[PDB]
């Protein structure tokens, strides 16, 4: 037990009074991300597909800027903390005995893996944010759909031509346009990559030490997008949103079927 205790004390970045501050700052920022949320919905309005597309894409631009500012701030905080961790350890920042230089190399390796850990955390924060807001949208749709404070979420028009009746936007326009919106969300969330691939970490993780090169593990390790593709439940929620769309259009189809009785006399009098 004392042997593994010692191995832990060696390991515990989580307890070391320097990597611990850096973690605490990054963790706080992750908290601020998780609370910031994502998508927005209006409880007392009824979007056209064009309206919903525009409002959501604008919301994507807003949060994209937020996430970029956030990431670049974190990037600075990480680099500056790493430079502290070297300078306090007797290591000189690379931008600035041989076994002691190897101890520098080892220290940079652990700093690398600590950064990568922070990236894994942030990535999971984004994953949870995305799926939870998708669940919220599903709950909005289904709770309004039950009325097929309770204003319906979307607006539609019914077109009577002499030949046939159709709704604008159609089920095709809802399915493809909301798929477009969903995929804008997906790629915007996917857009900003983890920190690991940034030049700051490339340099310090590959530190030029005793005037000799060193190397490191890299961004194509940490892969949020893999688990975004793995989350069967988020994909299912999107499919069920499409089922709510389909059922609502089935109700519209029924109403248009009633309107086809009026279309009978319309076609009769227009042929007369």
């Amino acid at each position: 037990i004392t042997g593994c205790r010692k191995a832990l004390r060696k390991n515990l970045f989580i307890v070391n009074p320097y990597l611990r501050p850096a973690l605490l700052k990054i963790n706080e920022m992750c908290y601020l991300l998780s609370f910031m949320g994502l998508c927005y919905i209006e409880k007392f309005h009824t979007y056209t597909l064009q309206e919903f597309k525009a409002a959501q894409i604008v919301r994507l631009q807003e949060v994209t800027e937020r996430l970029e500012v956030f990431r670049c701030a974190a990037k600075d905080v990480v680099r500056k903390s790493c430079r502290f961790a070297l300078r306090a350890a007797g290591f000189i920042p690379d931008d600035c005995t041989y076994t002691e230089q190897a101890s520098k190399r080892h220290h940079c390796m652990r700093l690398t893996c600590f950064i990568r850990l922070n990236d894994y955390l942030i990535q999971n924060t984004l994953h949870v944010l995305t799926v939870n807001t998708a669940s919220s949208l599903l709950n909005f749709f289904s709770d309004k759909l039950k009325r097929t404070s309770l204003v319906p979420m979307f607006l539609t028009e019914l077109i009577l031509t002499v030949q046939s009746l159709l709704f604008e936007p159609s089920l095709e326009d809802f399915l493809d346009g909301i798929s477009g919106a969903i995929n804008h969300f997906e790629n915007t969330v996917l857009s900003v990559p983890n920190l690991v691939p940034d030049s700051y970490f490339d340099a310090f993780t590959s530190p030029f030490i005793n005037k000799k090169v060193e190397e490191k593990t890299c961004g194509p390790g940490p892969n949020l997008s893999a688990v975004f593709e793995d989350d069967r439940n988020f994909l299912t929620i999107i499919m069920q949103i499409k089922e709510t769309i389909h059922a609502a259009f089935d109700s519209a189809r029924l109403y248009a079927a009633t309107f086809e009785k009026f279309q009978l006399f319309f076609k009769e009098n227009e042929s007369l």
């Binding site: 037990i1 042997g3 593994c4 205790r5 191995a7 832990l8 004390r9 390991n11 515990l12 970045f13 989580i14 307890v15 009074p17 611990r20 963790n27 706080e28 992750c30 908290y31 893996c113 600590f114 990568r116 850990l117 894994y120 955390l121 999971n124 994953h127 593990t217 390790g221 940490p222 892969n223 893999a226 688990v227 793995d230």
Partner: protein, 368 residues
């Protein structure tokens, strides 16, 4: 102070003890009659050994099972008795460390934090996720956990001291399921040991006498042909029991859940699935560093069979090692008590003043 909601066997110790001073069974009793029958009923509460001794006048449940605190009042009763009887102290003198299952819903996580803070006087406190500190007892920061025999059966991949929340899943079998299958095969054999006394005797049997076949088809054909591999046991009534294929059929249910009728891939393949969920870079470390835990792992042969089965699943490039702490049915408690020993950990706690503004948010955050 160290506190464990161990759902097969709950446990407590001062921090940095060598063993949990107190070990106690995962039960609290209520009087089974609604009136106080006699002055023994000074309380409506009979935690732990109290229930075990007094079952017949008492109402009997495992208050938790699987992934959650279920029944907050009865757990608070258990913890209160843990502090006042089992730890034999008013705790607030020293920090307290507590256990939770992995992927415990954050609602429960804060609810528990609140309950502990408001109900029990305390300087500073933390609840820890059984896999993470169980891995600390391994000494790795980077490892996958298995646990069975103290809870539902988890897989948990851990990188540099933290999980991949992406990759947490249960196999919905617990210690009872082993007793259930063993009761089935005993009743087939004809012992029909199922009464609550028989149930306890069978739990003793399964704890000491289980073994895991190295290649079940071969070992089963060997024992069924060669009954020299089936071994004798003395019952409390002086009967002799013979136990044979049952010794490894029971653990085999972990490998073939359909043996207990469960439609699931075995522990090996569900572990392999969990690994595959994570980064291949982590995956190689997980194959290098597997940790198995809980009373079901305590058996002989389990870690060898698991090593072979993971090697069969693992790519031929992967190095395979099951890491099998002789204590592994306590792994979490060992890691927690060791970590809590460290005065540098003292800064990690959360305490009253920050607990007010920060505490709801800051504990939820530090709990990760």
């Amino acid at each position: 102070l160290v506190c464990d909601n161990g759902s097969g066997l709950c446990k407590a110790g001062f921090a940095g003890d060598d063993a949990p001073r107190a070990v106690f069974p995962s039960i609290v009793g209520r009087p089974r009659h609604q009136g106080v029958m006699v002055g023994m009923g000074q309380k409506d509460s009979y935690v732990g050994d109290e229930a075990q001794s007094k079952r017949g006048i008492l109402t009997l449940k495992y208050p938790i099972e699987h992934g959650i605190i279920t029944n907050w009042d009865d757990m608070e009763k258990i913890w209160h008795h843990s502090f006042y009887n089992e730890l034999r102290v008013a705790p607030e003198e020293h920090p307290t460390l507590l256990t939770e299952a992995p992927l415990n819903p954050k609602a429960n996580r804060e609810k528990m934090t609140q309950i502990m803070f408001e109900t029990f006087n305390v300087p500073a406190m933390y609840v820890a996720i059984q896999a993470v500190l169980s891995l600390y007892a391994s000494g790795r920061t980077t490892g996958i956990v298995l646990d069975s025999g103290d809870g539902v059966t988890h897989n948990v991949p851990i990188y540099e001291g933290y999980a991949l929340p992406h990759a947490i899943m249960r196999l919905d079998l617990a210690g009872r399921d082993l007793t259930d299958y063993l009761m089935k095969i005993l009743t087939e054999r004809g012992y029909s040991f199922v009464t609550t006394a028989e149930r306890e005797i069978v739990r003793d049997i399964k704890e000491k006498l289980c073994y895991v076949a190295l290649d079940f088809e071969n070992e089963m054909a060997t024992a069924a042909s060669s009954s020299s591999l089936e071994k004798s046991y003395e019952l409390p009534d002086g009967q002799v029991i013979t136990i044979g294929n049952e010794r490894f059929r029971c653990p085999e249910t972990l490998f073939q859940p359909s043996f207990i009728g469960m439609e699931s891939a075995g522990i090996h393949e569900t572990t392999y699935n969990s690994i595959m969920k994570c980064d291949i870079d982590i995956r190689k470390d997980l194959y290098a560093n597997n940790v198995l835990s809980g009373g079901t792992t305590m058996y002989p042969g389990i870690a060898d069979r698991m090593q072979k089965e993971i090697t069969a699943l693992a790519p031929s490039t992967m190095k395979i090692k099951i890491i099998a702490p002789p204590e592994r049915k306590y792994s979490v408690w060992i890691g927690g008590s060791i970590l809590a020993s460290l005065s540098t950990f003292q800064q990690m706690w959360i305490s009253k003043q920050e607990y007010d503004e920060a505490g709801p948010s800051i504990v939820h955050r530090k709990c990760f």
